[PDB]
Design a protein around this nucleic acid. Structure first.
Ligand SMILES: Nc1ncnc2c1ncn2[C@@H]1O[C@H](COP(=O)(O)OP(=O)(O)OP(O)(O)=S)[C@@H](O)[C@H]1O
Ligand SMILES: Nc1ncnc2c1ncn2[C@@H]1O[C@H](COP(=O)(O)OP(=O)(O)OP(O)(O)=S)[C@@H](O)[C@H]1O
Ligand SMILES: Nc1ncnc2c1ncn2[C@@H]1O[C@H](COP(=O)(O)OP(=O)(O)OP(O)(O)=S)[C@@H](O)[C@H]1O
Ligand SMILES: Nc1nc2c(ncn2[C@@H]2O[C@H](COP(=O)(O)OP(=O)(O)O)[C@@H](O)[C@H]2O)c(=O)[nH]1
Ligand SMILES: [Mg+2]
Ligand SMILES: [Mg+2]
Ligand SMILES: [Mg+2]
Lengths: 257, 330, 307, 332, 315, 353
DNA sequence: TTTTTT
DNA sequence: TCCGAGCGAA
DNA sequence: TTTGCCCGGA
């Protein structure tokens, strides 16, 4: 077919999809010769998810010409569940397609399971939203960010991130009181994966809705480290690196009341 | 969309793209355009009857304010979406209180067909509208003001979209004729305007049907005969013949005339009643009792027709109602 | 007012504002005897007004008047009072106020009006209009109100007709028969009668589907036509033959898949000269005990297992 | 063939088989070439060809193989609440149109949209109809709607505005006799002259009823096994029409004006099971076309018949309504 | 964007609120001397209720506003759980304020709160009054249960008079350099019907549209209130003039049949100059037409028939 | 069963004994039943409509149609409320009364009936391949009691699946049947038997039950008192025999049911006393009747025609009464609370007298 | 299951 | 075996 | 100035 992309095991694609399933409903995949990119926007238009999968994630990949596949994530996840984590999963599409084929095939037997999901006429640009020179760029292990978010979300519906010279501060103020976590950069040559990195030109102070961060931290299952890029005038970028590509969340900050 | 815009129904193919293509609402268009020009956009309410240009205008305004990428910069909700209290408190409030993802600027929330929202959701909207005014503006659209709460009405700047007057419809028809290579006679244009009741959707749908009804639309001309054929509507001459027979002839001849006129082109009874009411409205009557009897009895007949019933008995009812009412004229 | 005059005046002395005792009664009427509210009123008013007397009591009373919703019996009493429907009374208690009375309890007000609108001596009767003619006009309006009520609670959910219903079900008929009450205001009997009718329709459905395999009728025809003959095959033989009719009654019950419970239910249905309670009470306990014993001593066919 | 009732057996297969709705069928046939079908609102009285027309149009547009993937049909037998409209209908309207095969593209116009048929749309709640409004407009690029109804006033004004209206006319002897005669010839039904036109007169605008009446009459004739023609008296007996003699008896009782006599006659009359609506129709015909009654009498009786027919349309007791009508006529 | 004038010129101090003079004076007195009672503020839309409560709170609490005020409105969750936990805890919390000052709970749009939730507030109001005081604002005061009304000071606001609206409008006009004529401001007042929000909105709309605020420019964009048109229709002496008003001023302006009929009902209800029995007959006829329209038969003929029947009655 | 109205009910078109022309028509329908249209039987109560429906089904499918069993079917509403429907069935047909479920009758049409329409059935007693080679038959009793929504739900099921299902609807009046449903049906008028036919049937019963009978005129009296209702006449014969020791006499009186006696008493009361107090007592009587399963429409009809029989009233009174009956019969159709409309009718009647 | 106020 | 919750649903 | 039936549970 025009597009043929084989995942060695369907579990890879299932985990990738589960990494952002809860935040958005409709997703637009563009497949090109260099791989598959995808974008989605949440119902309130406050959060945007951007996925990139390179050809190295695939055992075999072929995309003769660019193609766009719009689909609902609930139907896709329902179908992905009908297949086994061990089977080989081939995504197949034809030119000007009305559906996407998910082909679950196991080499042990001669059992083929072919699903066809009807596609939507979702006409929307991606805009490649990424500001060039972000004010502050930091990176830290995913488990620690998850813990900070989970602790502070019990206190308030909003979480403030303040970046200043050599210090990252998370703050939440609520009905029963307030909490404040301060971390500092540190390089540990024995365990680089625990490192906390901070580069910054302009200090930053931005407020975010807690429920959105609670959704965003679900990407921690796909990467041990999370990168955070912040600017005074731009959405905040939360990036989780995959073995081949990436999962990005662009979250708009609250208006300064 | 699929293939060209030539595959679309005319009501959608001719949807205004910019404010200059909205016709017959000049005061509103001028005011809102200068609102945008000066940077003073208040919370808006567009109130009016079907097909007068409300959705067209608000979408054109969004396009002008935000450019071609407006669709990712506004929150548009209508009756096809859930808009309960939970949606107001989560989706709408989050969008109102947060910056734009794509391009910096103020937020626009469009509540189309707002008369479909419950009282509780509308009340939840009050302090959302007031609290986030600095960065967010709401536009509400409605056909029925009575389903909107007084508190919601107070907070909006109201603009009434009128039934489209004759001149605006005429200009839009001229544009359509040029684009379709169509010809339209003056009497046909008059009949079209009369039957549209100032609803542009009716004009465009009828015109498309008329073009489909021609043998050769390049040479054939849309005459009023064509309009009446495709609409299955009475000619004015038929209405006058029936009314004359009712007012001046004996019962046998009036019954015969009604039945024969109806059989000629398979006319519906309700259409005859509407046409005759329009004719009788212009009559000068000595006795107010004549007007009273006519209106009450004909309204009763229209209501009974709306539920089905026996067509022959209803036609005889119309004849008797008119005769008995004019007996009062002495 | 006397039980609290001393307290209010002591407060006036302590807080240093002039209270004329003669107006206290009105204050007491303003708040309907709510002592907390009268103290709140004095506290709030004395902030800028240091003298409460005959020159300001009227507007203070107007501004602070207790607008308390009434309970159903009270709603019915006020709605049927003839004073509020006279020229001056209508000027004072407006049409809007009467509709608000409907909205105080909009599930019982129509029922209360329909219960009690026959129990007045009217003072609003028009010249030459007898009491019965006014009652007939009210009854017609109540029927129309029922039609509106049906439309409100349909799948359409037409709550915008609620004011109209208030007029048709409560205000207009009351306006026709308003006067004085010729007795106490009574709770609506419709609720209990509706409950009883529901019970008996359930019982009728059960009996119908037990006898379905043998009869040819709908349930209504069962009640109107069959049951009177079943009474002669199932009860009268007891009266004419004591315990000798047990076997024949059991044979009929078996033919129609009837239980002892069905027997009781059936006998409950009859009205007028055919009421059975006193007749069955008179049957000797020997016959009833033998009937029950013989019935429980054998098996009986079943029409519907685990209904 | 021998397993279909005639109404379903002779359902039109294509647009050229619909008989008397040319004013609308012509417009529809033009879209096989213009390929810009508008949103449609078919409305009209029972058994005039609305469902047949939409089905035949979809067949002509998509061919037998591609139809199923291009149609969503929802009628009064399906659940159509606001949640259904907001989820199932919206989701179908959103989808990309199924890809047509090469053979399909060769043999059929294959327009670039799908069709949603809301048959019996007048049974949908006003709120669900409201929920359809923006779905119809936003996805016009790939979806066209067809609403079908008997009572156009049950469709909310915004939806009627969005739709292009097609009124289906009543079918009578003037415009449906050809189709009825075709069916009669196909089935080898022998009839006297006048019988088919009488059937269509009795049917009162409904061709389904006329065909069913023809089938019942042919069954009677075949059972009789005598080779004779079906008569008009036989057809009227099958159609529940009151015999002219009985109607004359009623008219004479009304003329006499004695309340008790009218009451007793009506009580006896009801035992025959005559439908009150047919009785009222026949009385209307008898009185309004009678040269022996003057203008005032006919005005009054026309209103009386209108009132009684309206009351019967609400499902009332036929005995009570008929007796009231006859008493009122008698006192004219 | 720039602030709409309604929000730009929202009063920040009590002395900028017009109308309800005696009550505003009492509120200024309280703000100066502390000891704020529990209070219920009620009245019609857009007359200064929310403004007054917020101004009073700001003046009372100064810089302690952020920690000393709990505001909840219809956009918030206010079920029995919230009343029993969040509000109770806020009432119980420590907060040192200057003498005569208390924490303030503002319950805006309180008439939408359920009866059970209101019941849950009674003892919290009573037990913690030495540190917390409650302010309710509502449009329909009869929706606040009597036990809560008992614990509160009752402040019923009246509609704004033409003079108060004129004074506030003149202040804004001088601040904004607006050119106007007396007839223009009178037209603004006429179309506002005592709602200051609407007066300012229509002033902005007229200025944006046509620059100069005179009567003709005002009425180019602002409609005369259709309830007054409907009243004129109902009071006309002969059927033809009433039908003429219906045709020209309502039906051909685009007002829906349902809007016309519901307004007719509301206006007839309040026609104090027509005897009540006549209004009951008229209401019956109006309701018949309303039911027909709800069935989907909302045509001009139905409304004309309604008018004819009303004429038969009032004759 | 044991009661004579049931013991002697005919079981075939050959055993029918009144309205011979209708019997011939039914035989004509059953001659070639493969293209049988949907049927709608209408006529007065108790004349033999269901007897004839069963006889027609017997003629089409054989005596097995009389081997009936009852089964309970479950349904759930959108509000999650549980509902049960009793369904009568033979190997060849189903019988349902959807009005049993009130306003939820629509569910019965949209789920149960539709399912029967879409499925094939097994048969290991008449078919050699285990599948039933025949359409399914569904009898809908009290079809004029279906709500408009349920009737609408029938429309497309009757057309789409005509291959697999045929409907027989039975009703006592067609007035509440919507026009689209009547358009889809072959309408069969079922008139009441004459008094001679009733007398012949009753005489056959008298002979088979060894009842002593002084004169045949007695049967005629019964036949006249039943007003064409054959069920009523057979039950009345049995009751009279039981009360006269299985020996009818010329003096033996006709037995009226309890509810009829109550209604006649109410008529005498209304005629004697026109006043508010009388109206209150009348309300009590009406509540008593309604609570014991006498439907409101039956009460109105019986009261109207009892009043019109009063000898002391004049033509003006009677015309007023029949007008008021028409108006309030429509009210009963359009409303919910029956006592409201019945009381309104009684009040207007009292005023007119 | 809840329309309106002046 | 006894008791009445909560709803009006015949 | 508050009915009739009779829940779920003991
Ligand atoms: N003022 C107008 N000028 C030009 N075209 C119009 C105008 N009004 C309506 N139309 C035409 O009719 C179609 C529908 O216009 P809309 O603006 O969507 O109507 P609407 O006022 O939103 O109707 P409702 O309130 O949703 S029923 C447009 O796509 C145009 O083709
Ligand atoms: N114009 C027609 N041409 C040919 N046959 C028709 C026509 N109209 C009705 N019929 C016949 O009657 C039957 C029913 O036609 P339908 O199209 O289903 O009527 P309908 O307009 O959909 O009726 P409703 O609105 O559902 S009661 C067809 O199968 C045809 O046999
Ligand atoms: N008395 C007033 N004096 C000055 N401005 C007022 C006054 N009343 C209303 N406004 C203006 O209208 C706007 C709204 O005032 P609010 O106090 O919020 O009205 P409201 O009484 O709370 O209306 P509701 O009950 O929420 S619809 C203010 O921001 C002011 O600009
Ligand atoms: N001997 C005889 N009895 C009949 C006949 N038709 C009906 N019956 C009897 O009359 C009773 C009532 O008939 P039924 O069909 O239930 O009346 P319906 O369905 O309400 O019209 C039946 O139980 C039979 O006993 C007939 O043709 N011959
Ligand atoms: Mg619109
Ligand atoms: Mg159809
Ligand atoms: Mg406010």
């Amino acid at each position: 077919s025009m597009l043929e992309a084989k995942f060695e095991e369907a579990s890879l694609f299932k985990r990738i999809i589960d990494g952002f399933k809860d935040c958005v409903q409709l997703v637009n995949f563009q497949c090109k010769e260099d791989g598959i990119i995808a974008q989605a926007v949440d119902d309130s238009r406050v959060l945007l998810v951007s996925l990139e999968i390179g050809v190295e994630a695939f055992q075999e990949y072929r995309c003769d010409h660019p193609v766009t596949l719009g689909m609902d994530l609930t139907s896709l996840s329902k179908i992905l569940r009908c297949g086994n984590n061990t089977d080989t999963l081939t995504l197949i599409a034809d030119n000007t397609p009305d559906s996407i084929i998910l082909l679950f095939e196991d080499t042990k037997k001669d059992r083929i399971a072919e699903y066809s999901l009807k596609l939507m006429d979702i006409d929307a640009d991606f805009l490649k939203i990424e500001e060039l020179q972000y004010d502050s760029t930091l990176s830290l292990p995913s488990s620690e960010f998850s813990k900070i978010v989970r602790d502070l979300s019990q206190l308030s519906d909003s979480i403030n991130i303040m970046i200043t010279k050599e210090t990252i501060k998370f703050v939440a103020d609520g009905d029963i009181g307030s909490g404040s976590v301060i971390i500092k950069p540190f390089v540990d040559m024995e365990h680089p994966e625990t490192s906390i990195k901070l580069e910054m030109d302009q200090p930053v102070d931005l407020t975010f809705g807690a429920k959105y961060l609670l959704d965003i931290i679900k990407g921690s299952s796909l990467s041990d480290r999370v990168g955070i890029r912040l600017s005074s005038e731009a959405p905040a970028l939360f990036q989780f690196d995959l073995k081949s590509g990436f999962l990005q969340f662009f979250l708009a900050p609250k208006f300064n009341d | 969309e699929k293939r060209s815009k030539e595959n679309l129904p005319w009501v959608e193919k001719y949807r205004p793209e910019t404010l200059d293509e909205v016709y017959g609402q000049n005061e509103v268009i001028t005011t809102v355009r200068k609102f945008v020009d000066e940077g003073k956009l208040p919370h808006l309410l567009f109130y009016g009857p079907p097909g007068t240009g409300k959705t067209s205008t608000i979408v054109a305004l969004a396009r002008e304010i935000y450019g071609k990428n407006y669709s990712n910069m506004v929150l548009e909700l209508n009756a096809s979406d859930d808009r309960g209290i939970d949606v107001v408190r989560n989706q709408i409030k989050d969008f109102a209180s947060t910056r734009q993802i794509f391009s910096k600027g103020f937020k626009l929330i469009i509540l189309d067909e707002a008369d479909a929202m419950t009282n509780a959701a509308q009340n939840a909207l009050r302090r959302v509208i007031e609290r986030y005014t600095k960065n967010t503006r709401f536009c509400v659209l409605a056909n029925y003001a009575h389903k909107l709460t007084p508190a919601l009405l107070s907070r909006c700047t109201r603009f009434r979209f009128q039934p489209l007057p004759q001149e605006a419809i005429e200009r839009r028809i001229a544009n359509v004729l040029v684009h379709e290579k169509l010809k339209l006679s003056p009497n046909a244009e008059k009949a079209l305007i009369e039957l549209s009741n100032g609803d542009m959707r009716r004009v465009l749908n009828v015109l498309q049907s008329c073009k489909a009804t021609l043998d050769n639309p390049d040479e054939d001309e849309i005459s009023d005969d064509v309009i009446y054929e495709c609409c299955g509507a009475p000619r004015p001459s038929d209405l006058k013949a029936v009314l004359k027979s009712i007012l001046e002839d004996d019962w046998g001849t009036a019954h015969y005339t009604l039945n024969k006129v109806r059989s000629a082109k398979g006319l519906a009874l309700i259409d005859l009643i509407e046409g005759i009411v329009k004719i009788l409205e212009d009559y000068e009557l000595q006795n107010e009792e004549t007007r009273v009897h006519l209106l009450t009895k004909l309204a009763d007949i229209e209501y009974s027709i709306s539920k089905g019933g026996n067509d022959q008995i209803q036609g005889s009812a119309v004849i008797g109602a008119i005769k008995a009412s004019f007996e009062n004229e002495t | 007012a006397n039980s609290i005059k001393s307290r209010l005046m002591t407060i006036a002395i302590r807080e240093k504002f002039k209270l004329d005792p003669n107006v206290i009664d009105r204050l007491i009427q303003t708040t309907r005897g709510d002592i907390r509210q009268v103290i709140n009123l004095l506290s709030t008013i004395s902030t800028t007004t240091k003298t409460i007397n005959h020159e300001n009591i009227n507007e203070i009373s107007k501004a602070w008047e207790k607008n308390i919703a009434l309970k159903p019996f009270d709603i019915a009493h006020k709605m049927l009072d003839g004073q509020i429907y006279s020229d001056i009374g209508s000027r004072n208690f407006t049409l809007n106020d009467k509709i608000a009375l409907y909205f105080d309890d909009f599930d019982f007000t129509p029922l209360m009006i329909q219960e009690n609108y026959l129990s007045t001596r009217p003072s609003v009767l028009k010249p030459g209009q007898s009491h019965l003619e006014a009652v007939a006009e009210a009854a017609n309006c109540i029927s129309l109100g029922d039609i509106v009520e049906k439309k409100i609670r349909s799948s359409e959910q037409l709550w915008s007709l609620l004011p109209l219903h208030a007029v048709l079900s409560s205000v207009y008929p009351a306006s026709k028969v308003a006067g004085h009450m010729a007795g106490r205001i009574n709770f609506t009997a419709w609720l209990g009668q509706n409950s009883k009718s529901a019970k008996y329709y359930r019982l009728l459905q059960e009996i119908h589907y037990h006898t379905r395999l043998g009869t040819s009728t709908d349930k209504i025809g069962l009640r109107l036509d069959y049951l009177p003959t079943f009474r002669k095959r199932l009860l009268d033989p007891f009266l004419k033959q004591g315990a000798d009719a047990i076997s024949s009654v059991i044979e009929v019950m078996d033919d129609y898949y009837l239980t002892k419970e069905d027997w009781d239910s059936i006998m409950e249905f009859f009205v007028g000269p055919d009421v059975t309670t006193a007749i069955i009470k008179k049957i000797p306990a020997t016959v009833k005990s033998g009937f029950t014993r013989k019935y429980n001593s054998m098996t009986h066919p079943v029409a519907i297992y685990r209904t | 063939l021998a397993q279909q009732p005639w109404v379903e057996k002779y359902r039109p297969k294509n647009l050229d088989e619909v008989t008397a709705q040319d004013h609308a069928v012509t417009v529809l046939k033009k879209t096989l070439k213009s390929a810009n079908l508008p949103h449609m609102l078919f409305y009209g009285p029972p058994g005039t060809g609305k469902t047949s027309t939409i089905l035949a149009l979809t067949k002509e547009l998509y061919g037998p193989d591609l139809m199923k993937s291009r149609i969503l049909e929802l009628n009064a037998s399906d659940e159509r609440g606001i949640s259904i409209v907001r989820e199932k209908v919206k989701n179908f309207a959103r989808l990309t149109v199924s890809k047509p095969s090469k053979h399909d593209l060769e043999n059929y116009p294959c327009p670039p949209y799908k069709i949603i048929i809301l048959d019996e749309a007048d049974s949908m709640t006003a709120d669900a109809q409201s929920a359809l409004r923006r779905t119809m407009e936003t996805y016009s690029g790939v979806t066209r709607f067809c609403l079908i109804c008997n009572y156009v006033t049950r469709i909310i004004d915004p939806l009627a505005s969005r739709c292009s209206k097609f009124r289906f006319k009543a079918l009578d002897a003037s415009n449906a006799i050809d189709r009825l005669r075709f069916i009669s010839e196909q089935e080898n039904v022998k009839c006297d002259d006048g019988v088919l036109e009488r059937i269509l007169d009795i049917s009162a605008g409904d061709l389904r009823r006329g065909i069913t009446l023809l089938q019942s009459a042919s069954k009677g004739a075949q059972y009789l096994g005598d080779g004779k023609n079906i008569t008009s008296t036989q057809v009227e007996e099958l159609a529940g029409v009151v015999p002219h003699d009985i109607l004359i008896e009623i008219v004479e009782k009304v003329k006499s004006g004695d309340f008790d006599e009218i009451k007793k006659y009506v009580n006896t009359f009801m035992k025959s099971g005559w439908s009150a609506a047919s009785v009222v129709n026949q009385l209307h015909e008898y009185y309004i076309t009678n040269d022996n009654f003057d203008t005032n009498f006919k005005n009054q009786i026309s209103w009386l018949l209108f009132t009684t027919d309206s009351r019967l349309n609400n499902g009332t007791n036929e005995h009570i309504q008929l007796l009231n009508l006859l008493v009122k006529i008698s006192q004219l | 964007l720039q602030l709409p004038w309604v929000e730009k010129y929202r009063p920040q101090v009590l002395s900028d609120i017009v109308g309800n003079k005696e009550t505003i004076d009492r509120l200024q007195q309280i703000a100066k001397d502390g000891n704020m009672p529990h209070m219920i503020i009620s009245g019609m839309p857009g007359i200064g209720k929310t403004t007054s409560v917020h101004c009073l709170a700001h003046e009372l609490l100064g810089r302690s506003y952020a920690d000393g005020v709990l505001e909840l409105n219809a956009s918030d969750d206010r079920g029995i759980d919230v009343v029993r936990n969040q509000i109770k805890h806020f009432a119980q919390k420590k907060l040192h304020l200057p003498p005569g000052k208390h924490k303030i709970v503002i319950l805006d749009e309180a008439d939408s709160m359920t009866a059970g939730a209101q019941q849950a507030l009674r003892r919290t109001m009573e037990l913690y009054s030495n540190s917390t005081r409650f302010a309710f604002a509502c449009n329909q005061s009869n929706k606040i249960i009597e036990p809560l009304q008992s614990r509160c000071a009752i402040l019923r606001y009246s509609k704004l008079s033409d003079e108060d609206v004129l004074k506030r409008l003149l202040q804004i006009i001088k601040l904004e350099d607006v050119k106007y004529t007396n007839d223009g401001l009178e037209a603004i007042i006429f179309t506002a019907e005592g709602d200051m929000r609407q007066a300012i909105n229509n002033l902005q709309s007229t200025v944006a549209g046509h620059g100069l605020v005179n009567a003709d420019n005002v009425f180019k964009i602002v409609d005369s209130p259709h309830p007054l048109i409907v009243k004129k229709m109902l009071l006309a002496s002969n059927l033809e003039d009433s039908i003429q008003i219906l045709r020209t001023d309502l039906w051909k302006k685009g007002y829906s049949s349902i809007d016309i009929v519901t307004t007719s009902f509301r206006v007839t209800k309040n026609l104090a100059q027509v005897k009540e029995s006549v209004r009951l007959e008229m209401i019956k006829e109006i309701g018949l037409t309303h039911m027909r329209i709800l069935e989907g038969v909302g045509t001009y003929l139905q409304l004309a028939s309604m008018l004819a029947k009303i004429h038969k009655l009032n004759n | 069963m044991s009661l004579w109205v049931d013991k002697y009910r005919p079981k075939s078109l050959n055993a029918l004994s009144h309205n011979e022309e209708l019997t011939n028509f039914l035989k004509s329908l059953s001659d070639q039943p493969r293209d049988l249209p949907h049927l709608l039987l209408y006529g007065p109560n108790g004349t033999g409509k269901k007897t004839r429906c069963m006889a027609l089904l017997e003629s089409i499918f054989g005596p097995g149609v009389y081997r009936l069993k009852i089964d309970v079917r479950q349904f759930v509403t959108a509000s999650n409320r549980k509902l049960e429907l009793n369904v009568v069935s033979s190997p060849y047909h189903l019988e349902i009364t959807p009005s049993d479920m009130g306003n939820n009758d629509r569910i019965v049409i949209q789920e149960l009936l539709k399912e029967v329409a879409q499925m094939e059935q097994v048969d290991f007693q008449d078919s050699k391949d285990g599948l039933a080679h025949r359409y399914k038959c569904v009898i809908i009793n009290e079809a004029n009691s279906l709500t408009k929504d349920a009737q609408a739900a029938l429309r497309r099921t009757m057309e789409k699946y005509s291959k697999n299902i045929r409907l027989i609807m039975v009703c006592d009046s067609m007035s509440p049947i919507i026009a689209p449903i009547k358009s889809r049906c072959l309408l069969i008028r079922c008139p009441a038997p004459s008094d001679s036919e009733i007398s012949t049937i009753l005489s056959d019963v008298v002979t088979n039950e060894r009842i002593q009978l002084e004169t045949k005129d007695i049967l005629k009296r019964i036949a006249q008192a039943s007003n064409g209702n054959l069920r009523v006449s057979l039950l009345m014969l049995e009751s009279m025999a039981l009360n006269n020791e299985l020996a009818l006499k010329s003096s033996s009186p006709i037995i009226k049911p309890d509810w009829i006696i109550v209604i006649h008493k109410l008529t005498r009361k209304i005629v004697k006393e026109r006043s508010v107090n009388s109206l209150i007592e009348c309300r009590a009587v009406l509540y008593d009747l309604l609570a014991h399963c006498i439907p409101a429409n039956i009460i109105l009809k019986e009261l109207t025609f009892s009043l019109l029989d009063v000898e002391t009233l004049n033509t003006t009174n009677k015309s007023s009464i029949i007008e008021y009956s028409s108006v309030f019969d429509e009210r009963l159709s359009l409303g919910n609370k029956a006592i409201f409309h019945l009381e309104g009718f009684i009040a207007k009647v009292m005023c007119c007298l």
